[PDB]
Amino acid sequence: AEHVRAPYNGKIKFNEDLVHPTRTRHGHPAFLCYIDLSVIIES
Amino acid sequence: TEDEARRRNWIERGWAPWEEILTPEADFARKSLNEGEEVPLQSPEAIEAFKMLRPSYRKKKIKEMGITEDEWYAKQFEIRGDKPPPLDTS
Amino acid sequence: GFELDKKLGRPHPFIDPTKKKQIETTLTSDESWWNWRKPEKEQWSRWQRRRPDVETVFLKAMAE
Amino acid sequence: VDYDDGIDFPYDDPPLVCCFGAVQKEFVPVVRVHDNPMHPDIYSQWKMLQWDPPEFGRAPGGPPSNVAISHVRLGGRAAFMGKVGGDDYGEELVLMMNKERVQTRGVKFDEGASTACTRVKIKFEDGKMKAETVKEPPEDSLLASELNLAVLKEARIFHFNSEVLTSPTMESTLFKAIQWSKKFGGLIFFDLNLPLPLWRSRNETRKLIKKSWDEANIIEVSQQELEFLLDEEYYERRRNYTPQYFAEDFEQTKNRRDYYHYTPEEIKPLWHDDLKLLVVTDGTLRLHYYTPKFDGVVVGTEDVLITPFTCDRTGSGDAVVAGIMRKLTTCPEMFEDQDVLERQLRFAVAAGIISQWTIGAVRGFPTESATQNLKEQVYVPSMW
Amino acid sequence: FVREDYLVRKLSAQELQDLVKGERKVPLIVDFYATWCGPCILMAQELEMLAVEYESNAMIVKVDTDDEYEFARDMQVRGLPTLFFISPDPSKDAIRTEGLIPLQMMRDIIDNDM
Question: Where do breaks (C to N over 2.5 Å) occur in chain B, by preceding residue number?
Answer without folding.
Answer: none
